[PDB]
Symmetry: D2
Subunit: 252 residues, 4 copies
């Protein structure tokens, strides 16, 4: 009921955090368009959830995104919320091991893909007085070791969220972001598998939070539903979903 009659697009919604956000919006009564560059997870999610449908779309391809928006409007008649979740964290890379071209590529996904869908969706969000939710990262705010390009892309997303919030406020379109800390997802598991001791890597990630565990996609999803449906006086905020990782002293 909380978001009934509304239409939501979630990028990277085929697995991980994006899938948890898809589920949370379906559970709120919304119709959800799952956007993903990979077919496997998103196609299964459409079969599983009445009210969710899957559209293949690579957010780095401008024409893919144009088609995502026009098909969303053609099939559902309105657009109320865009969740820019698609993005990627590379394996650990020392600064001297990064490249300008790798940096540009990560910018294309983590930042410009968010920019392009938001831009194409804003005319419809203005009609609906809808809202934008960007999935950034805690490490955009506090930094991270061996991740100069990734951290830079999320710093940009969080800052862009505030600029856009200023620009769209006279039209009643809110723009917010969520900064998750360690969330247990296939990406986290993939990255842990590259480590010498994956179980040690995972235990270390759990202990980075005062709460002693990592977060869940469903917890990010509930934050997104709050921002969309109940946060009518929130715009340009950075909602931390981190288990307290930013608090207090730790072993650095």
């Amino acid at each position: 009921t909380r978001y009934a009659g509304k239409v939501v697009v979630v990028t990277g919604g085929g697995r991980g955090i994006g899938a948890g956000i898809v589920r949370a919006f379906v559970n709120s009564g919304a119709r959800v368009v799952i956007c993903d560059k990979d077919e496997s997870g998103g196609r299964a999610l459409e079969q599983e959830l009445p009210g969710a449908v899957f559209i293949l779309c690579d957010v780095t391809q401008e024409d893919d995104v144009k088609t995502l928006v026009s098909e969303t409007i053609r099939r559902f008649g309105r657009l109320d919320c865009v969740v820019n979740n698609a993005g990627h964290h590379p394996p650990p890379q020392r600064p001297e091991e990064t490249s300008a071209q790798g940096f540009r590529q990560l910018l294309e996904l983590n930042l410009l893909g968010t920019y392009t869908l938001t831009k194409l969706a804003l005319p419809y969000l203005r009609k609906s007085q809808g809202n934008v939710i960007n999935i950034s990262s805690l490490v955009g705010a506090i930094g991270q070791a061996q991740a100069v390009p990734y951290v830079a892309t999320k710093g940009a997303v969080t800052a862009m969220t505030k600029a856009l919030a200023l620009d769209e406020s006279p039209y009643g379109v809110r723009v917010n972001c969520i900064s998750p800390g360690n969330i247990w997802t296939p990406l986290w598991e993939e990255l842990a598998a590259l480590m010498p001791d994956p179980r040690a890597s995972i235990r270390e990630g759990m202990l980075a939070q005062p709460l002693g565990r990592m977060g869940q996609p469903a917890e990010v999803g509930a934050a997104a539903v709050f921002l969309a449906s109940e946060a009518n006086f929130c715009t340009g905020i950075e909602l931390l979903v981190t288990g307290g990782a930013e608090l207090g002293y730790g072993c650095k």
Copy 2:
């Protein structure tokens, strides 16, 4: 349904933001104890809302607060959430017009009252894996003119929220705060009435937000219900409910 079977105490719940928080929790299915030093608003709210009851309590009086907690447990058998909302903003005061004793008095209400109820409630919150929500202010983070004591008390509340979150995390008790900006309440109206041109004061307060309006108690209430019921990986966060007042350049 979202917070059914839960018991919530809201201090200063007789009017303004506190009353909006009371209403939001009742609408979520919780039973609510309205604490206030004034009888008029809170007594009427109890008559109006099934599931809410009023207990007279001045949060600066330690024995009042002891009785608030013990009566809450006696009457409802559990305690899941404490919302420390009671507090006051004095009229504008130049720094040379403040006094150490006025500062101590405002500290007693805005900070130590929050500290005392939280302390007395924590043994019951640990049993329920409940949570604490402190109502701070945006001006604790960014400052405000002619309000040195007030700003200082809210800086302390926001910082204390993070310290307590660290201490209580091994027990599964989350501690968060909400920082509202300009919310249209009887306090805001009272303060505007002291100005030479109250309508000019109010128009200026509306235009301090990119959204062009002040916030509502119900919007603070929805943020509080989110933190209590759906933010299980959030602890020690400062949730801004400000309409974007902190964003961008303005006339300073």
Copy 3:
């Protein structure tokens, strides 16, 4: 030369960070009044440093502070900078082990002592277009375990710094703060000595910073001299002197 002809008051200047700030200002060419409630360290510093003199003053005693200001003006004819450094970190205390009265006492030293000297000094700082520097703490911003009252007092100091900066900006008086992280001082050493394994406590404190060491009083002192003498467009800022402790993930 950088602060020649200027007169600076440093509270708690008899040892630790305060003594490092005294030394830095003397080395810059300023005359320095060392305020401390203890005679031993401050008296020796006056004998050691030409241009520094010691005045016994407990910043929690309003009449002590009145005399500190009037004696500073009587002896040196002007007042350009007040460094509010006096303050104390109690031993670790679980929240249920704190008291309202202990909290009030720490507020008297860490917050109201800073407030009282600043208030009495502002008429002279206005004449000189001088400035105020408050020594807060990183843990006011990010929290700390087993330190609810301390963290709250430094949250208040940092917020008060911004409020005062707003109030005094039309008079050209800047108000800034420094937030040190772990600085190796007699206080740090005293607190480490209370731990079961003091050498383990100290090694843990060094490793809380990416730089792998604690900071020095002289490094806080150089930050203070910068704010006083060269930061003419800085007001209301929080200058972090923390070795990066706030950056990245750590063992929490």
Copy 4:
């Protein structure tokens, strides 16, 4: 004397903030390499300042930057500090008026140019235990209207500064940034000239700060010299040089 015997590279040092930073480091005793894509200002500065020399270099051209570093080492034998100041603020642009390609171009200058010089300089900074200073912007932290691409690039710079600080801390290389607010420069003047009422635009920019004026390049320069020469326990910090623009409520 404060930075005697040291070698500093300042990008965009031919005018504006960069020229003020060049002057501040020369006045501190350092030798300075002025990098700029434009010959006019930087060539004159070399003639004016003994100890400063001009090297033509476009920071978006990787081979220009390779030559800048190798010529700095060839001519001066060491490299102690890199100030990444080159960058540009476009005219106001509504979000629907921006393009992905314009965004990529601004990223090339404001972000990747900083990344490329830092990367090529780090082997020499490690030898000297030198430091990096990035010139970001206050609007990366708080947002700005009609500047989505610009704000995003400075959000990235500030975040990248913290990531790099973490990576380089075990080598004793500090990485910090300065976030100026409104600084009176040829860029500010150029942008004001595009407005309908340039004098009204400028008066509005002065009043955006509680101090009632814009900042000077020399004030940014003094902050940079502090970070390089005296801030040995500061790494990953964001030093605000804004006149208090971020403080308090304003007309938004």
